[PDB]
Input
Amino acid sequence: HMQQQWSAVDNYLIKALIPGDPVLDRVLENNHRAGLPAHDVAANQGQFLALLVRLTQAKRILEIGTLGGYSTIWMARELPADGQLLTLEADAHHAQVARENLQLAGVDQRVTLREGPALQSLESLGECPAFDLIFIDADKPNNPHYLRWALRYSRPGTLIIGDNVVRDGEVVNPQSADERVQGVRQFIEMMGAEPRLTATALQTVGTKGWDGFTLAWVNAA
Amino acid sequence: HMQQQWSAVDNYLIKALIPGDPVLDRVLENNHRAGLPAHDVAANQGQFLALLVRLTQAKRILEIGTLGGYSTIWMARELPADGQLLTLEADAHHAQVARENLQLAGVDQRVTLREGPALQSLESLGECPAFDLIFIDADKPNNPHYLRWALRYSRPGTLIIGDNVVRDGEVVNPQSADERVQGVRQFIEMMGAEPRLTATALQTVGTKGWDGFTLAWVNA
Output
């Protein structure tokens, strides 16, 4: 009932505002063909991320959770010639598919894909310069750990985005047995209690159903 | 059922993320006392607008549709010392409540409120500098005209925000009798046709129910 309406509105809005893109179409076709979980963002969400790159004037982006590289491509296209996007993927099959999509989209020079446990990769960064934009959407149970590393590699004005935080409403459940819910709640609470962050969250609907995301600006200490 | 879930999720997120603000509470209470239509953004939406001010590093903001000044305050608090927010409000009663609220919140010095028909005010500006952020949430029938003016007073990198574009699903109707819906449709289709804009839109839910907004970056 509500879903058909959300989809209809998304269809109208997306067709009106966002131009057709042959390479992005092919990226999504590749993901489905490879049998990946369909966790790709909707086109309007991708364009939103691209606008966040423009707004931050990002030259350095960190993405936690590559999947097939759909979000990666939306962001990476907006980087300057000397820009870099580091993206982390644990799954070998996802990394393989993502590598192919990065090449197809012509962003494989700007993007560095590090395959392995995301935390292992984060622990190995060493004296890395701060990132300008950080996108978090991997294994939810470890969300609070990702936030800690995000803060470590931030500067004043860095934007941190946390996707998929609503969990079909279960985010409000303080006694959930779901580690993904526990991780998201720890993440949100950590964020709210951190003076170095000014944060908000928006619930969204559309073709991908009911969900939401956090957006946090890093304050000067 | 769905609404109660959206409300519970909003209540959780807002309480977790956004510090209590007795002054903003009072602004909202003032709006209700004056009998204003309850069209104020939710607190998470207000904080979003405030982050957009930080992201654009805005020094000049244009808001079309003041109401009680609730969103005006969220934005104006983020302006630097040399910052200015121009807000346009056609309703005399609304303008008076808004002035009171801006003064209460201690931001009136950062805000110029121009009372009168918005289009007339926009016609009056002449050769002023561009705005860094532009927020459109007034009379929907006039949206297409507001966008033309917004473009006129833009620079490359200006962000244009159009709030309340979903019209509870009726935005999809190719032939509705509502002037608000047809205004929003012309606005969206005008936005999509303009190569000087890179636009998107997001549908939102929460305590204010189902709605959505557009976000457009002005190209060089």
Summary: Helices of chain A lie at 2-17, 22-33, 43-56, 70-76, 92-104, 118-123, 143-152, 179-193.
